[PDB]
Symmetry: none
Subunit: 143 residues, 2 copies
């Protein structure tokens, strides 16, 4: 058992960096969309646009492996879906449509006035800030 | 077929006022600790302190259903742990947080400081905002004055 512990160990560790081309495909779809903030639905459907023998559960397990091993980050921005964004590694803003899933980054920094107010009001030294907005987007208001 | 669906409807209604006791157990733990932001694991522990004939799956499934219903909100903090944040009742926008990147204090902000800004994004990007999630990161008030006793 004591060495069976070991056998299993090296099984698991192998399973973590040894990448099947099934896993490798989920990674391809991540690298091919860095700015984009992809859901499990998303990464799935795009893996099928090259290798559709894949299986959704495979795609999920792979993502869930990456996020453990701090290569991607699960995030919930509050649209009620966990999104897997890579960490190639003020942070920008997001508008996330709670229907058509349309993301839009805001390049500007609209906080300013708020950032300062906080500081005064709480005696807090701001360094970084991450804002996400929820609302069915321009195009869905017309379709 | 539509008969079978109605049957299924009656099925679930039973299961539900069958299952509410373990629902109430979990909703307690949340309410008792609104200042904390509990991970599912956390809840689980606190619920066997009263109702340990519970099992973990029924707690999670409750937690998820409750964030389905906006009653609570799932939140990572950079610590790679999904945590269930209770929304103050009747609120229209989720609270803000100040996180400390050191000591790790978390301050819910009950006011809504993004009003003028909501109005700007709604304008500039022809968007219809229905909620938001704002978080700041920064060494907090007391960590300014306890690393002025450590240099
Ligand atoms: Mg700023
Ligand atoms: Zn973004
Ligand atoms: Zn949209
Ligand atoms: Zn909170
Ligand atoms: Zn602090």
């Amino acid at each position: 058992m004591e060495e069976r512990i070991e056998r299993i160990k090296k099984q698991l560790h192998a399973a973590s960096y040894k990448l099947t081309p099934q896993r490798e495909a989920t990674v391809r779809v991540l690298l091919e969309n860095e700015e984009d903030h992809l859901s499990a639905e998303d990464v799935y459907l795009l893996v099928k646009e090259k290798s559709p023998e894949i299986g959704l559960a495979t795609v999920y397990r792979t993502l869930e492996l990456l996020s453990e091993l701090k290569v991607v980050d699960k995030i919930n921005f509050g649209d009620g879906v966990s999104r897997y964004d890579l960490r190639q590694e003020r942070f920008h803003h997001h508008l996330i449509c709670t229907q058509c899933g349309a993301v839009q980054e805001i390049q500007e920094d609209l906080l300013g006035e708020v950032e300062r107010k906080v500081e005064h009001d709480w005696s807090f030294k701001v360094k970084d800030h991450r804002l996400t907005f929820h609302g069915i987007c321009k195009n869905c208001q017309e379709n």
